Every structure is written in structure tokens, then in C-alpha cells.
Amino acid sequence: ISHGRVFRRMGLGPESRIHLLRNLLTGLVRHERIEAPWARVDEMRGYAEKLIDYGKLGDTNERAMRMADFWLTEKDLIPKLFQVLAPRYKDQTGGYTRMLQIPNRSLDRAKMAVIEYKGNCLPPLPLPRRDSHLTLLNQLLQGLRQDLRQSQ
Amino acid sequence: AIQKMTRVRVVDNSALGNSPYHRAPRCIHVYKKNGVGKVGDQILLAIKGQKKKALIVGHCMPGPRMTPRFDSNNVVLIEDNGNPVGTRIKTPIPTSLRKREGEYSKVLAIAQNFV
Amino acid sequence: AAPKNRRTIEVNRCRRRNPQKLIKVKNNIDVCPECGHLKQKHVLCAYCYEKVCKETAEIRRQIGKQEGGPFKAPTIETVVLYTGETPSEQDQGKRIIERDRKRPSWFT
Amino acid sequence: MRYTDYFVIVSGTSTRHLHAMAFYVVKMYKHLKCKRDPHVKIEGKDTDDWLCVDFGSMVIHLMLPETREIYELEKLWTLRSYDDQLAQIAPETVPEDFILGI
Amino acid sequence: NTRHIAFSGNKWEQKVYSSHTGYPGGFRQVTAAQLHLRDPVAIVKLAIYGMLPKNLHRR
Amino acid sequence: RFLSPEFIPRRGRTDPLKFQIERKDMLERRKVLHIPEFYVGSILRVTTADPYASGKISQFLGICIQRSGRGLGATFILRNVIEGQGVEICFELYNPRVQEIQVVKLEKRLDDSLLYLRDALPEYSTFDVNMKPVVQEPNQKVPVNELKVKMKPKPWSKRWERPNFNIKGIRFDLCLTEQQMKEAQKWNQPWLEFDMMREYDTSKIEAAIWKEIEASK
Amino acid sequence: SGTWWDEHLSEENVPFIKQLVSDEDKAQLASKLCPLKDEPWPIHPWEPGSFRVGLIALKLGMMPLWTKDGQKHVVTLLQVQDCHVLKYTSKENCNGKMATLSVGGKTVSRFRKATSILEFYRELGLPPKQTVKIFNITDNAAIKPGTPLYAAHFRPGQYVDVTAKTIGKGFQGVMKRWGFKGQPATHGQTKTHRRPGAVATGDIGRVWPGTKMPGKMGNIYRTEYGLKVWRINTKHNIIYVNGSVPGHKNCLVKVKDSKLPAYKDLGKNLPFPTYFPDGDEEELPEDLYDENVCQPGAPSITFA
RNA sequence: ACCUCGAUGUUGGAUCAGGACAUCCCGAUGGUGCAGCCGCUAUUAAAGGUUCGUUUGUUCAACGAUUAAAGUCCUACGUGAUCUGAGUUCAGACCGGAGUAAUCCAGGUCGGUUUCUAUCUACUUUCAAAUUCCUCCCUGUACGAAAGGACAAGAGAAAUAAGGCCUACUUCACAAAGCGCCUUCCCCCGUAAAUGAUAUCAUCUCAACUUAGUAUUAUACCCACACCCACCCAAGAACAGGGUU
Ligand SMILES: [Mg+2]
Ligand SMILES: [Mg+2]
Ligand SMILES: [Mg+2]
Ligand SMILES: [Mg+2]
Ligand SMILES: [Mg+2]
Ligand SMILES: [Mg+2]
Ligand SMILES: [Mg+2]
Ligand SMILES: [Mg+2]
Ligand SMILES: [Mg+2]
Ligand SMILES: [Mg+2]
Ligand SMILES: [Mg+2]
Ligand SMILES: [Zn+2]
């Protein structure tokens, strides 16, 4: 029995859970794109988004500094968080990270996800693209839309 | 809940209850179908080398909402007849004792404080 | 506990060869419109992804050369540049990374 | 005092005399009782000396003179915290630092 | 006219039909009369069924 | 602004409509009986109808020790030592039985629960049954009592020294030893301060409750 | 290959299709808000032995409710959402003693439903419902399909029966499933703490059928009998029922009149075919209450 | 008696029970040396129920407090591939006794290794149509010299059992739980009566027949069937199930 259990147990306990996630997050901050097991990417993903909001609070916020101190192990990334990442996402209220499913790991046969912060410098991931508006079905649907708008 | 082998406190002016002794009074028996005793229930006591019947008056275990909850297990020594051996009850007793089924009127009569 | 009698080949063959224990056919395969290799739907094309990751691998190598040592992640944004292209006016004031090859078609 | 409007104490000659009174009072009660007025129960029929009956807003105590001398119910209810019987008994306090000495 | 069958003697309410559900205490014993009221077809059905050979062809 | 704890709902999969229904019911009751702004440290005197009697009036005074529950069933618990007996009563806020709630002495304590007062010395929970209300100017900061309380011997109802309770209002120096303190530290869980998905922000939620409340009046 | 509705739609068409189908469910609900006006079936006055249709309600949650005697009764809240009549089957065709009425529940998406089911609902002229339950009715109780149903269908003082699928606890041990005592924790007891005891007697060379042993618990239909209806909110269509109701919150329950012998002929005054708000015979207030219920916004209770 | 059981012994206990009625309690009758209250005896009934401690390894028993009662059995004196090992059993030791001794003892006393990864059979949500105690009313009545003290009909409180649930309390905290809350519905097959023959009266009928007596059943629950991309889930070992407007 475990309905509405939100967090998935991960390491060799709750302390380890955090520690793995913190490592993943540290990587992602630094490199801006990271491949890891699908469960762990999904798990860390949330904390990644929550980090940008704390980063949006600014350098001056003492609370936000203490949070950044804990979650970034490199200590050189903390300036980057506050002077690179926070300014980048000024417009958006949410949705800073994208996650995708990529082929399974060779050794292990594990489900693998790539996670990246949006608007990075890197070459863009091959992304799922919906079919063109000029397709036969889309053209017939556009036909129906024309009918409804031109009726009134 | 006061069950078998529970220490209780005799809140009476009765000599037997207030007498200095090496043992605290112990609950021998509970007069209920299931062993647990709430307030108003009768229980048997081993005090000072004798058995005595007693009425439960307030207890530590939480009860219904607006009903009071005491910090000690308080009992009043009664005869088998129903006559309380003591004359006065210093400690407050819950008012709920009134509407409950049984012989409670006499104990209410000798009590000073209702909470 | 221990088996009381040897299981026959027929009994075993019924166990092993029922549809439950068989490999199920995958019906979610498609052609990658980009490269023409096979990809599963709902999953990124293995070929296309390798291609991206080899490019991004080399970019990260150039990042290391310029940064030159640990704990030196800059406090500006970054941009990557190829042979025969120049930073814009808005590109001014951010980290530049150079390349010795032409810009890929897919990377714009 | 959240008990009753009127408290009543009456004495009796003998045990069987007390039953006579209590049983008449309850019997007459039912006669004049309102429909919705709840039914009442006599207390302590097994008891020798003390009988009690509770009504809606009246409470009655039937006793011998013997039990009146030992309970002093009138004194309790007229003057609450100021009666002689409460004075003799004193609250017991645990010692400071919680050390007993012989 | 399976309802209008006749029994010889006191066989209407001497003769019982026994059946057990798998479950403990599942033994049910009903008289021919009381079974007849449940299902009129039942008596004839049970008689014929018992008369056929006890093989796989029976059913 | 002060919003009553009961109005802010817990994290759940309860549909919003259920809360809207309950809020309307609560607000109707608030019109009838004034609910005062009180905190966990504060002193309250509650007057109720007594069903075990023929509509006689009971008042009880004591110190609040906890405030919990949501919607109509939301409650608080009052403590007091009456003539050498500790008494605790849990009261429903929206019970029709209650006649009047008054704030006799409005103060916060260091911590949000005071259930340790059972284990504290008797006098810290002993409050005069007949005391005069003491009132302060409307636009004043809610005053905090920074009292720490002395304790009984170490067998307690709960192990208060453990950091999960996070009690700031106990004189630990007096009762515990240094080794006991460092023993308690084995249960620290320092990551829990920085767990980001563990937190519950009620900002937008409270805003919408305010919108409902201002509409009601 | 399997195809869902989005496979071949551009970003431009997706919002358009979404809004189009949303419009049509609203239009279909709009059409049927006037049952009596549209050519209905004959309405018969109630006589003894008659059974009427029920409802399909969603369990919102739970609340306290107070009575004048001062007692606290917990109520469960049941919201009637897009409840309609689907199909009528005569006593002949159903092969039952009673005729049957089909009732639909929570409105659901057309895109996730089966072909035939979509066809069925198209013929009706209503959007697809999540649950369907069948009610056993007498001949007089017949209601033309497509007719909506409302919470005021029930009135306070009425007792109801409530059936839903219980909360699913998956594969459970014998101890939590059947409340077996289990074995002591100390004094030896090697690797036996929660095990079922001796299963059966040694004489029998088997295990009796229907023995209690560890297995899948919950997730089955259970009914609660004789729940009093304390209160009706007419605006939101809320039924307030006494005590606990089976299944989780935001689940669909089947609620009908109580079957119990005590309340066998209590349906006299209760709106027989159904309650028709469109009738305008008397406009029902915001709320309906039982006599004993303390009104929210009424003066504080005295026992005087 | 027996070439039938047992090489991880047997007694108890734990857990979980299945069944019989020769019924301990609750139900229905007949008689009574049945005024009423308790009682005594017999017929019918196995749906349900049948307590907790102390002494002793206790099965027994005694003792204490209860109850409505604390039934009698059978099931390899049920059940140890589900569990203990307390007594009695192997290697050590002592008291007492036998014996020249080695050693022994139906006595007393201390210590002493309980394996198994389930192949097959069987089974793993069938239905609860719920039982009982107490208090009050009748009534303090009938009855009875008094003392005492009813039955049907009805009301309220509890306790357990089954099935659920989380608004409060509580362990806790997107939830799960009890110490908490909600619901819980048919009757018994023994006799008591008429009318009326054999046997013109009478007679309750293994006579024809007529009422207690339905001398058999409920009602309720479930009940449509795409894609089986992917995601989510109050659904879940996997699988399946629900939602995805
Ligand atoms: Mg692991
Ligand atoms: Mg404790
Ligand atoms: Mg246990
Ligand atoms: Mg072992
Ligand atoms: Mg163990
Ligand atoms: Mg021979
Ligand atoms: Mg042999
Ligand atoms: Mg018999
Ligand atoms: Mg035998
Ligand atoms: Mg065995
Ligand atoms: Mg040893
Ligand atoms: Zn490709």
C-alpha cells in the first residue's frame, strides 16, 4: 500500500537519495545537458526547476544563497547560477528544463533520459516535431476551421 | 483506559484512600464486557491488603471532543451498595457523569467542582 | 521441498512455448525522416542523437582548453562559432568558442 | 453550579419508609409528567440508608438521620469551598529537586 | 407437462436430493416436493441423467 | 494580514469545490459567533452550553497548547491546572454549542506547539481562572513571550530533546547533560532543511481565500 | 500500427479540435435541459410497491454536521455530475421481474472511448459517460431516455443505499486481510511473526475451498445500507449522507433508495418519476435541511 | 492381534480451525409436589456464542475475579516442510541408594545443535438474511397474608462480529492506520386447536381435510467494450484496470 507517495526511494536511504540528486543537479548546472537513468532524471528534474526560482530571488537573498551553497558542490557554479541562469529565464514563469527519452543503455539495458536547461549554447537535441500543416488531414481540418469562421 | 494492573489515584477524603502506604492502588478487575474502562465504569482495587470497588472519574487517554481529559487516573472508592466511603471530592469531576447510565447521583452530590 | 517426479518434455514444452513467455512484436517502429534510419516512436533517433553528441563532445573539449583548469566556470553566457563567421552586436560581451570546420546543416 | 436548579434533602424513619416515599414521588411524577418530559430512575434500592432520585431540575436525597450526620450535604451546597470538611484535607506537593528524605 | 408428473407412494416428501457446494457447511438436502417448487423440470432432469451411461457421451 | 489556520487546506487530491462548500459554511458561522484572533501561546476563556444540564452555561479558562484541523472540524486545545489537577479540553471552533470566545491575553510563544507543558513544572501551566483581559493597540506587532520553561525529571511523555520536535522553549541546560545532547544529535537529518520539493507554499492559495472572504462581507 | 487522435495534427489544428469538441459537449448538454417540454413519457402518481430510478454521484469528501440535541454526525458529500437516463429495457426483454433503466455518470472524453460506445452516445445525442449502472424499476417508474437527473431527486429524512468499489490495497498478507492474530515477536519464534497458522486438519488430504489466506484485498463492490440524507444543496447538486461511503474520494458511487424492511413504504411523498426543476411548480431553495440539523447561520444552541 | 506409524522423538502450549449432538447460554414446546420469582424433568433446535489472572512444562486440578454461558467429544489424544522446546530423552556434574569394582537407578537437581530454494494435488474476495447483555416503560402492575415479584408490546444505551471510512482525536502527515467514526435486514416444524368417519357419541387426521405455518425464499451487487504509442493514477508483484478535452 502506497497511494499518493510522491518521492521515489533511490540510493541506500533518504540521505543518499538527496546526495545522488545533488550530484546530478551539479552536473546539469555546469554542463547544461546530461544523460542519466530515466527515473533519476525525472526525480532530479523537479529540484532543477525549483533551483532556478531560488536563483531568481537574487544574490542579496540570504536564504537563497544558503540553498545554492548546499545544492551546488563546485562553489564556482553559484555565481553562474545567479548571474547567468537566473537572468536567462527572466521572462518565463516556469518550464526551464526539457527531458527526452533516448535509446536504452548498452551495458545495463536501463531507460535513459537526456535533460537540458533551455536556451543553452550546445547543438540542439533532435526533437519530436508534429507534421506540417500542409498534410492531407491538416488541410481537411483547416477546411473545417474555414467553414466555422466564415459561417459567421 | 484503565485495565488490569493499572496504578490509580484515589481522589477522596476517605481514610483508606489517603492513607500513606508502600503500594499505589492497583486495578484488579474491570466491570465491562471488554476489559478497557472509560469514565463512569466500575473497577476493582487492591489497596492496603483488601479488595474495594471504585468508580473511574477522569483519565489521561483522550475522549470525545468537548469532554475534559485529566493528567492522572482518578477513582472514587465506593461500597458494593453504591455508597461512597469518603465524604468529599476535592478534585473536579466531568459533568458527563450525570447523563451516563447508572448510579452516579450520589457521587455528584459529594463533589464540589464540575469541569 | 524437492520434486517428486521428473517433468516430461511435453509438460515443459507447454510451459516454455505459451504466448505469455514468448517475445512480443513491437508495433511502434518508424523511419527517422531526417536520416532514414529506424527509430522507435516516443524515443529519439539513435543515429541522430549520436551525431549531436559527437558535435557537443568536441565543443566541450574546446571549452576545457579555454577555461584551463577546474573551478573556472565564467559569469557570462556562451556562444559557439565556426570558420568564416563573426559575433553579432548582441553576441558582444559573451564567451566565444572557435571551430576549425564548417557549421553543420542541422545546427543553425 | 451546573447541576440542578433545586436540591432537596429529606430524612426518614426506617429503610422501608424511605422506599415508600421515593416510590410515591416517582409514581406521582409520572401522573403529572409531560409527554416529552423524560422518564426518571430511582437510585440505590439495594442500599440501606441512602436513596436518591433525580428529576429534570430537582434532585432529592432520602436518608436516615445517621447518614445526614456524616455527609452534611446541605453544608456542601450552601457554602462550596468554605466547608469544614474541605479544610482538614490539604493538597500534597512533591519536594523541590524531587528528592525524598526518610 | 413436467410439472404434472406423479410420484408413487410418499415419494413426494420422502425422497431427498443431496448436493454439496465446495465450501464447508455447504451440504444441502431438499425434499422432492420443495425441489419441485424451485424448478419443475428438475425431477425429470435428475432421473434421466442418472439413467444414462456414466461416460463422456452423457453430457 | 491574519488568516485562520483552518482556512488554508492541506496538500490533497480533494477537489477545490469541496473546500469552497466548507468555507461558505464556516463563514456563515463566523458571522453568528465572533472568532477572535488567537495564537498558540494565547489565553482564552470559552463559554459553552452544557447539554448534560438544562442549558446552563459553562466557562473554562486556560492556555492554548495546539491548534489543528481544517474546515468545519478545525479545533484547538486549552490547558489549565484547576486546584491541583491538570485539565485539557479540545474545542471545535464551529460547534454551535459554544456561546462566546474571548482572547484574555494574546501572545505567541517560541514554538507552535506546547504539548511539552505537561512535562514542564506545574506552575507554567497554572493560570488564574478569574483574570482580567489585557488589551493592546490595534496596529501593534503580535507580542512574543521568550520564556523557556524548567522541566521535571527526564522520563517524559515524548523525547523533546530530539531535533524532530525542534523545541526552542525548554531550558535543556538545567535537565540534560552534554553527552545526552550529542546522543540526541544522531537523529539530526541536515538535508531536510534544504529539501526543495518538501516545501509547501500557500501564497496563491491564501490570496484566493482572501478574495472569497472579502466577497463574503 | 496503433494511432491516437493527435498523431497527424499540426500545432495549429490541435487547439482548434480541442475547442470544437468542447463546444459540442456543451451544446449537447444545452439541448436536454428541458425534459417536460420535449415530448415525455406518461407520469404516474406513486402507489405502494413502486421503485424509482437512482443516481450516479461522485464522492467529494467528508464534513461534520450538527444536530439540535448537540450531537455531531459526520456526513459524506456526494455530487451528482451530468447524470442522465441512457436506456429503458422492458420486463420482458431483460428477463427479470423488474424493468430496467440505464443511468450514466461523470462526463468523459470521446477520444478515449470505444467505437461502438461512441456510436451509442451519438444516437442518444449526449457526450460519453464514465460509469453506467442499471436500476431495477417498476413499469410506472419509466423515464424517457436522455432525461437529466438532479440531487433534489432525494429529500432529507430519506434513507439511501450506496455502492462503490472499495479502496484497493493490492496483495495483502493474512494479518491485515483477515485480522489473524499472528505469532509472538520474541521467545524464539524463528521466522514466524505474521504467517497464517495451520491451514487445515491433517485427516483431510486437501485444503477446504474459500479458506482465508493471503491475497488481493479491496478493489471490489460493496454497499452501505440505510444512510440518512441530512441535507441537499440544490445549486451544486450535493447530497449529504450519514457516515462512511465505500471507495476513495473523486470516485463514482451508485446511490438509490434503501432496501431495508424498515423503510419499505416510505416513498409516498418523494418525487416519483424524478424531480423536474423545469416544472416550476415550486422553485426549490438554495438548500434543503432535516429538522434536527443545525442551520449554518442560525443562533447558538441552548438546551433550554 | 499386526511385518500397518515414527530415524529431526513425545507431552504441553502458539496459530488456524473442520465436524458431531448426547445443548453450557440464547430460541420454540409438554408436564410439574408450576400462586409470582427462582427451580426440577422431557421434546425440538448446532445459525451464533462459550472470560481473564495466580501456582505448576501442565494436560488436570486448586485458588481469585467475572459472565449469559464459561458444554461433551472427534479430527494420526487435528495441525511442529506454520512456530516454541518448558517437562521426559545422547555425550558433563551432584545428592540419595544398589553394586568388590567398572557401571547402574521408573527418585531429586544443574547444562545441553529443531535442516528443507515447493515439482504435483488442494486452496488463495460465496453469502451475510447480527448476535447478545443491561436499563427504563408496562410497574412496581398482575400474583401474593406479607416479604417478594412477572409475561407479551415498546424505548434507550452498550459490548462483540462482519463489512467499510478518515471530518475530528490519536501514531502520523500529498497517504497509511486505531486507540477513532459509519452501516448491519427472513423463520422454524416440537406442539396448540376446530369440523368429522371407520367405531352414526366422542376423537387434532400415518382418514378424507381446516388455521397457527411462508410449513420457501430473498431482494441486493456485477452486467457497453477502441488504442492496447506514450504518460499519469486513489489500479497494481508482473499482467490487467481507470483517466489523458
Ligand atoms: Mg535500489
Ligand atoms: Mg506515553
Ligand atoms: Mg503480535
Ligand atoms: Mg535456527
Ligand atoms: Mg524474527
Ligand atoms: Mg496368529
Ligand atoms: Mg513401517
Ligand atoms: Mg437433540
Ligand atoms: Mg482416533
Ligand atoms: Mg505437517
Ligand atoms: Mg548457561
Ligand atoms: Zn535520425
PDB file of C-alpha atoms and ligand atoms in Angstrom, chain A residues 126, chain C residues 32-39 45-49 51, ligand 12:
ATOM      1  CA  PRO A 126      16.676  16.062 -32.272  1.00  0.00           C
TER       2      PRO A 126
ATOM      3  CA  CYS C  32      13.556   8.575 -38.957  1.00  0.00           C
ATOM      4  CA  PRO C  33      12.552  11.200 -41.588  1.00  0.00           C
ATOM      5  CA  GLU C  34      15.845  13.022 -41.032  1.00  0.00           C
ATOM      6  CA  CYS C  35      18.472  10.319 -41.588  1.00  0.00           C
ATOM      7  CA  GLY C  36      16.297   7.420 -42.797  1.00  0.00           C
ATOM      8  CA  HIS C  37      17.434   5.005 -40.085  1.00  0.00           C
ATOM      9  CA  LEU C  38      14.972   3.166 -37.857  1.00  0.00           C
ATOM     10  CA  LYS C  39      13.797   4.843 -34.661  1.00  0.00           C
ATOM     11  CA  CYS C  45      16.656   8.555 -33.178  1.00  0.00           C
ATOM     12  CA  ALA C  46      19.796   6.686 -32.088  1.00  0.00           C
ATOM     13  CA  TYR C  47      21.745   7.819 -35.156  1.00  0.00           C
ATOM     14  CA  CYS C  48      20.716  11.477 -34.933  1.00  0.00           C
ATOM     15  CA  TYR C  49      21.489  11.553 -31.206  1.00  0.00           C
ATOM     16  CA  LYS C  51      25.597  12.812 -34.304  1.00  0.00           C
TER      17      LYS C  51
HETATM   18 ZN    ZN I  12      17.799  10.062 -37.456  1.00  0.00          ZN
END
